[PDB]
Amino acid sequence: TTYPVLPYLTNAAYGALSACSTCENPELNVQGQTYGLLSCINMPESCTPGWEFTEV
Amino acid sequence: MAQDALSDGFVRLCIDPSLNFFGEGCKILVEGQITDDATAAENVVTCVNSELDLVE
Helix, strand or coil: CCCCCCHHHHHHHHHHHCCHHHHCCCCCCCCHHHHCCCCCCCCCCCCCCCCCCCCC | CCCHHHCCCCCCCCCCCCCCCCCCCCCCCCCCCCCCCCCCCCCCCCCCCCCCCCCC
16 A cells, blocks of 8 residues: 555556566566566665565 | 565575474384373373473
């Protein structure tokens, strides 16, 4: 609920990242900090997860 | 989240100085008298797992 970013901005970036920009090799998984890091949609940094672990 | 290297959840880490790897091996049986405070059930086969459970 408190996600401090306009949702459609992140959805679009992630979808584009999953596009042929990365999935010309269809077996590649988009995860982790090596590949799942959609380029910086700068946001404030905080000591709060937003999603508590049980929620995760 | 905590430290980054463990953030993604690929690796779930436990630190414990009291575990053990051995698959349970040969089984041995011991028999004898007991004193009155012995909470164990009389004439009942029981498992044991430490040297301090004695007396109790």
